[PDB]
Design a binder for this molecule. Sequence first.
Ligand SMILES: *[C@@H]1O[C@H](CO)[C@@H](O)[C@H](O)[C@H]1NC(C)=O
Ligand SMILES: *[C@@H]1O[C@H](CO)[C@@H](O)[C@H](O)[C@H]1NC(C)=O
Ligand SMILES: *[C@@H]1O[C@H](CO)[C@@H](O)[C@H](O)[C@H]1NC(C)=O
Ligand SMILES: *[C@@H]1O[C@H](CO)[C@@H](O)[C@H](O)[C@H]1NC(C)=O
Ligand SMILES: *[C@@H]1O[C@H](CO)[C@@H](O)[C@H](O)[C@H]1NC(C)=O
Ligand SMILES: *[C@@H]1O[C@H](CO)[C@@H](O)[C@H](O)[C@H]1NC(C)=O
Length: 298
Amino acid sequence: ALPAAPEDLRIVQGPIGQSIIKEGEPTALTCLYELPDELKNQRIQLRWRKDGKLLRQVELGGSDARLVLHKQNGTLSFASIIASDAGQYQCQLQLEAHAPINSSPGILEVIEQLKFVPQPTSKNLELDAVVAKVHCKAQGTPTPQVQWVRDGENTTLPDHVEVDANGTLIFRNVNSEHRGNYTCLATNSQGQINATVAINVVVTPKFSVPPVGPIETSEQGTVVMHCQAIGDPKPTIQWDKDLKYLSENNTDRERFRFLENGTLEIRNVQVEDEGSYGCTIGNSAGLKREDVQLVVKT
Ligand SMILES: *[C@@H]1O[C@H](CO)[C@@H](O)[C@H](O)[C@H]1NC(C)=O
Ligand SMILES: *[C@@H]1O[C@H](CO)[C@@H](O)[C@H](O)[C@H]1NC(C)=O
Ligand SMILES: *[C@@H]1O[C@H](CO)[C@@H](O)[C@H](O)[C@H]1NC(C)=O
Ligand SMILES: *[C@@H]1O[C@H](CO)[C@@H](O)[C@H](O)[C@H]1NC(C)=O
Ligand SMILES: *[C@@H]1O[C@H](CO)[C@@H](O)[C@H](O)[C@H]1NC(C)=O
Ligand SMILES: *[C@@H]1O[C@H](CO)[C@@H](O)[C@H](O)[C@H]1NC(C)=O
């Protein structure tokens, strides 16, 4: 129950009753004011509120951003409208220790861009994964309907593929038939947008020929240890000793032979050659390692 503000302090041109603006467009809401000279040194605040919440304020009397409030004329200016700018706006002229002067409210409606939020992207699913999900959400005016189809010659979603009420594409017990290009369509009266994404099915490496040991030999003998892998993408193999990689850069080049088929052959075995040798198999999907003990008998 604060005292009323003086009559010469007033909002001359408040916001328009209703504005409709397209997302991406600039706009501005008005709050032209008259500030009498006998208050120029008082604490006077011009505030803009959105849905009842303070949004911008500037002191009018005593002591590149997208959304700014201009001191001289009270304009709330939007350099570019975004969907969340929609709401009910009101400006206030507030002298310290007095009742605020309230403008009429102004409704700001935004014609939203038809677009995905966010835009679906390509995914790699693990073979035999129990559940895998690909979200699809869009905005627009009105809110668009979202659906999934398969791209290409056969548009039907494979078995154990479904779309839930949120537009989420769901794969159950991922198998090789799930691989393909899948299209999310968002449709309303503004048109239709189409995000097609690659859904690949990958397989972490597995040993087809794992290293097998213990490998026992005598000094000056020759040993071989094997490593071959399968997977999708085609895995690479890498030899280590005690988790330290092995190559020509750190082994005797006339004794250690790294064959193309994954086999490691050690000629003229020495006592120091003993230890734990490992093969790591890897692709873009994952990694595995298996090790073997090399025993050198005196
Ligand atoms: C208020 O002043 C600013 C700064 O010059 C200007 O950009 C804006 O257009 C003005 N408001 C109106 C409604 O003209
Ligand atoms: C299209 O794909 C579905 C789902 O995998 C399958 O059941 C159907 O037989 C396919 N149709 C043709 C003509 O290949
Ligand atoms: C849809 O999303 C909401 C969250 O907005 C969640 O609570 C609900 O469980 C989801 N529905 C399904 C079927 O996943
Ligand atoms: C998707 O389309 C691209 C381009 O046509 C093609 O190379 C690819 O094999 C298709 N399928 C997947 C799973 O990416
Ligand atoms: C979706 O867009 C792709 C291009 O990315 C196109 O090849 C495909 O035919 C479109 N699908 C539909 C149902 O419009
Ligand atoms: C790799 O090739 C070498 C030489 O031909 C052979 O001795 C070895 O057994 C091969 N490894 C496997 C796992 O076949």
